[PDB]
C-alpha cells in the first residue's frame, strides 16, 4: 500500500527537518531552503505496512507558482506552522488553506505545530516576550484546526523526536480513507 503525502506551511516552520527525521532517523544539520523534493517512509501503523511518498514544498513565498505541481493525487496533506512563530499560525488560514482547499478539495489535512522544543525554552520565550509575542499555545492550534476542519490536530519537535511518530501514524489513518 502507497500513500501520498505533501507537506506544507511557511519557510522555516520545520518541514523538512519533519519528513527526514522520520525518513531517514536523522536530523538534517545543513538548513537548505526547500523548492521540491521527495522522500520515502516506511511506516507500520495498527498491524499494516504503508509507504509513504513524502512530496517537500517551499514555504517561501517565491516559490509560489512551482507549488502546485506538488498537489496532484494527494492523500494526506500536512500543514504546519511552528509553536515559535504566531505569525506562521496566522497565515493557516490566510494563506495555506485556501491553497491547499483550492488544489486539493477534500484531501484530509492534518494541522501541525512543529518545533514543539521552543515552548518551554526560555531563552524563545524572553526573545518573543521583547515584541509582545509568546509561543503559540496548544489550544489556538486546536482552535485553529476546528476553524479550517482538519482531519487532526499533532504538535511535535523534529529536534527531540517528541511526537514525530505520531504525525506519520495519523497521516497514514487519515491516507488510508481514500
Ligand atoms: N528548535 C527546533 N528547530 C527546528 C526543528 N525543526 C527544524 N528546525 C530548524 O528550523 C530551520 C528550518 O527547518 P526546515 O525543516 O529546513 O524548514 P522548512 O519548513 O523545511 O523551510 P522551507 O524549506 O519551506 S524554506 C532549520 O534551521 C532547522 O534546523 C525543531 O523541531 N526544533
Ligand atoms: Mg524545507
Ligand atoms: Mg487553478
Ligand atoms: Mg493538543
Same mark, same amino acid.
Given at each position: 500500500?502507497?500513500?501520498?503525502l505533501?507537506?506544507?506551511?511557511?519557510?522555516?516552520?520545520?518541514k523538512?527537518?519533519?519528513?527526514?527525521?522520520?525518513?531517514?532517523?536523522?536530523?538534517? @544539520?545543513?538548513?537548505?531552503?526547500?523548492?521540491?523534493?521527495?522522500?520515502?517512509?516506511?511506516i507500520?501503523?495498527?498491524?499494516?505496512?504503508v509507504?509513504?511518498?513524502?512530496?517537500?514544498?517551499?514555504?517561501?513565498?517565491?516559490?509560489?507558482?512551482?507549488?502546485?505541481?506538488?498537489?496532484?493525487?494527494?492523500?494526506?496533506i500536512?500543514?504546519?506552522?511552528?509553536?515559535?512563530?504566531?505569525?506562521?499560525?496566522?497565515?493557516?488560514?490566510?494563506?495555506?488553506?485556501? @491553497?491547499?482547499?483550492?488544489?486539493?478539495?477534500?484531501?484530509?489535512?492534518?494541522?501541525?505545530?512543529?518545533?514543539?522544543?521552543?515552548?518551554?525554552?526560555?531563552?524563545?520565550?524572553?526573545?518573543?516576550?521583547?515584541m509582545?509575542?509568546?509561543?503559540?499555545?496548544?489550544?489556538?492550534?486546536?482552535?485553529?484546526?476546528?476553524?479550517?476542519?482538519?482531519?487532526?490536530?499533532?504538535?511535535?519537535?523534529?529536534?527531540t523526536?517528541?511526537?514525530?511518530?505520531?504525525?506519520?501514524?495519523?497521516?497514514?489513518?487519515?491516507?488510508?480513507?481514500?
Amino acid at each position: 500500500i502507497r500513500k501520498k503525502l505533501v507537506i506544507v506551511g511557511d519557510g522555516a516552520c520545520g518541514k523538512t527537518c519533519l519528513l527526514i527525521v522520520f525518513s531517514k532517523d536523522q536530523f538534517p @544539520e545543513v538548513y537548505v531552503p526547500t523548492v521540491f523534493e521527495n522522500y520515502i517512509a516506511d511506516i507500520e501503523v495498527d498491524g499494516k505496512q504503508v509507504e509513504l511518498a513524502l512530496w517537500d514544498t517551499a514555504g517561501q513565498e517565491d516559490y509560489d507558482r512551482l507549488r502546485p505541481l506538488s498537489y496532484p493525487d494527494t492523500d494526506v496533506i500536512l500543514m504546519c506552522f511552528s509553536i515559535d512563530s504566531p505569525d506562521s499560525l496566522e497565515n493557516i488560514p490566510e494563506k495555506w488553506t485556501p @491553497e491547499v482547499k483550492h488544489f486539493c478539495p477534500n484531501v484530509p489535512i492534518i494541522l501541525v505545530g512543529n518545533k514543539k522544543d521552543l515552548r518551554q525554552d526560555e531563552h524563545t520565550r524572553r526573545e518573543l516576550a521583547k515584541m509582545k509575542q509568546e509561543p503559540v499555545r496548544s489550544e489556538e492550534g486546536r482552535d485553529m484546526a476546528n476553524r479550517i476542519s482538519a482531519f487532526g490536530y499533532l504538535e511535535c519537535s523534529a529536534k527531540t523526536k517528541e511526537g514525530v511518530r505520531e504525525v506519520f501514524e495519523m497521516a497514514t489513518r487519515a491516507g488510508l480513507q481514500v
